[PDB]
Amino acid sequence: KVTVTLVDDFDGSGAADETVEFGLDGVTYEIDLSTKNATKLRGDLKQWVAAGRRVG
Amino acid sequence: KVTVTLVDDFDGSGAADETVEFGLDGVTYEIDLSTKNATKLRGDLKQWVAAGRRV
């Protein structure tokens, strides 16, 4: 059979639960992550977002 | 005197050297940072950038 899986991009340990969008230096990225890893990414960026300013 | 300073947004303590653009969950941000803190931010994102895909 042909099996198609949405795999977690960060640790590859299991399936992803969501696709998270983020950005750096004018480049936009997407990443498929478990709920746990999406939570880690959001946590890593939390204080930076709090210190930054919204722009278009 | 009117004193003007470009202040690091993250630590409020150092002089800012550059503005970094970044984004999370569909919102885009700018932040003025010392060279050291800009490197810290880019470092925090390094593992995620490497694992993710453009657009």
Numbering used by the authors:
A (entry chain B): 4 to 59
B (entry chain A): 4 to 58
From the paper:
Lsr2 from M. tuberculosis is a small, basic protein (Mr = 12.1 kDa, pI = 10) that is highly conserved in mycobacteria and related actinobacteria. Lsr2 is a DNA-binding protein that likely influences the organization of bacterial chromatin and gene regulation by binding to AT-rich segments of DNA. The Lsr2 dimerization domain forms a compact homodimeric α/β structure. The dimer forms a 4-stranded anti-parallel β-sheet such that the helices are arranged in an antiparallel fashion and are on the same side of the β-sheet.
Here, we report the structure of the N-terminal dimerization domain of Lsr2 solved by X-ray crystallography at 1.73 Å resolution using ab initio methods. Crystals grew from one of these constructs (Nterm2) after a few days but this was dependent on “maturation” of the protein sample (by some unknown process) over a long period of time. In retrospect, this “maturation” process amounted to degradation of Lsr2 at Lys-4 to generate a truncation product with Lys-4 as the new N-terminal residue. The structure in the monoclinic space group P21 was solved at 1.8 Å using the latest version of the ARCIMBOLDO program. A 14-residue long model polyalanine alpha-helix was used as the search fragment to arrive at the ab initio solution. We subsequently learned that these absent residues at the N-terminus had been cleaved by contaminating proteases in the case of the P21 crystals. The monoclinic crystal structure reveals a linear chain of dimers formed by crystallographic symmetry. The N-terminal end of each dimer forms a single ß-strand (ß0) that is then paired with the N-terminal strand of a neighboring dimer to form the linear oligomer chain. The oligomer is not only stabilized by interstrand H-bonds, but also by a network of polar interactions between Lys-4 (the new N-terminus after truncation) and its oligomeric neighbor.
